[PDB]
């Protein structure tokens, strides 16, 4: 798509692995049990202070080379346009046209 947006997606992923791995997950563990004292702890407020880009909810599965944000397939990490072209060329092992 756009080079800047392809890059920014990756930057979100490295931000996610750096922050969402433990910082943005221990706060969730605090909020889960009503027994846990969340209200004074401000685990909500502390987790607000974290960057938005820490949250995986901001991620977007784009095509691994093409950058296409829609028509994505999780098995291949490829757009529907690219999967069709590489399967036809015999590039994805064990993939072929269907009949039944």
């Amino acid at each position: 798509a756009k080079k800047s947006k392809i890059v920014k997606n990756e930057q979100r992923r490295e931000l996610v692995q750096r922050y969402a791995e433990r910082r943005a997950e221990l706060k969730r563990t605090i909020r889960d049990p009503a027994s846990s004292p969340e209200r004074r702890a401000a685990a909500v407020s502390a987790l607000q202070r974290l960057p938005r880009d820490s949250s995986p909810v901001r991620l977007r599965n784009r095509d691994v080379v093409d950058g296409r944000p829609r028509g994505h397939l999780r098995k291949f990490g490829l757009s529907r346009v690219r999967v069709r072209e590489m399967a036809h060329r015999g590039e994805l092992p064990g993939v072929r046209k269907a009949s039944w």
Binding site: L73, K75, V81, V83, A87, L92, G94, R96, K97, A98
Partner: peptide, 24 residues
């Protein structure tokens, strides 16, 4: 058997689809 259905054309033309499988 893992089956996937894709649209042939890059733009519109939804009614034309292509099926693939991977058999293990």
């Amino acid at each position: 058997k893992n089956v996937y259905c894709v649209i042939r054309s890059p733009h519109k033309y939804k009614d034309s689809r292509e099926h693939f499988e991977m058999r293990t």
